[PDB]
């Protein structure tokens, strides 16, 4: 599934980041980082889900997860 995050899409992110030239190994490196990021955030969110005894991860769960990870996000209930 993570290979689903494609080279060109990673190129795009790098572009919005101001990157001009990209090494061929960046794509796999980026996927690894992206995965650790999602695991960390989702783990916390699901923990808020489970605590609330729900079967549905809510935007709020993610928002609270992001806040704990020092990644505060505006736009989804805080």
């Amino acid at each position: 599934n993570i290979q689903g995050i494609t080279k060109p899409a990673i190129r795009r992110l790098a572009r919005r980041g101001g990157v001009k030239r990209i090494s061929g190994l960046i794509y796999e490196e980026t996927r690894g980082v992206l995965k650790v990021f999602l695991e960390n955030v989702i783990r916390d969110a699901v923990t808020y889900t489970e605590h609330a005894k729900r079967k549905t991860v809510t935007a709020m769960d993610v928002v609270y997860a992001l806040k704990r990870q020092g990644r505060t996000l505006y736009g989804f209930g805080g």
């Binding site: 599934n1 993570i2 689903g4 995050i5 494609t6 899409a9 190129r11 795009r12 992110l13 790098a14 572009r15 919005r16 980041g17 101001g18 990157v19 001009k20 030239r21 990209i22 090494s23 190994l25 960046i26 490196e29 980026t30 980082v33 992206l34 995965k35 990021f37 999602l38 695991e39 955030v41 989702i42 783990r43 969110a45 699901v46 923990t47 889900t49 489970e50 079967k55 549905t56 991860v57 809510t58 935007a59 769960d61 993610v62 928002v63 992001l66 990644r71 996000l73 736009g75 989804f76």
Partner: protein, 97 residues
């Protein structure tokens, strides 16, 4: 047969994407990865659509920000090309490692 020199179109893409705000990762593939990772912590979960969107917004802002630091690290090494080495340095200084 017209052809742009290497770097010319790249610079053009930077200007385009730094101008917009649309998510840059295709939605379905991303949603698929989110659910796969989540499945390892708790089975048979459902997701509010906005939950998936928050994660993608958070994820892409993080990656874009991370690429900026990586870029700064590459330039610091007299390069114009980013490498795993640059991503690694940035994450180390950020304390993510």
């Amino acid at each position: 047969p017209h052809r742009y020199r290497p770097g010319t179109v790249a610079l053009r893409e930077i200007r385009r994407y730094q101008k917009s705000t649309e998510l840059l990762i295709r939605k379905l593939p991303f949603q698929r990865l989110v659910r796969e990772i989540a499945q390892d912590f708790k089975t048979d979960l459902r997701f509010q659509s906005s939950a998936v969107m928050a994660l993608q917004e958070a994820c892409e802002a993080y990656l874009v920000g991370l690429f900026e630091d990586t870029n700064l690290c590459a330039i610091h090494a007299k390069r114009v090309t980013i490498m795993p080495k640059d991503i690694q340095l940035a994450r180390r200084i950020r304390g993510e490692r």
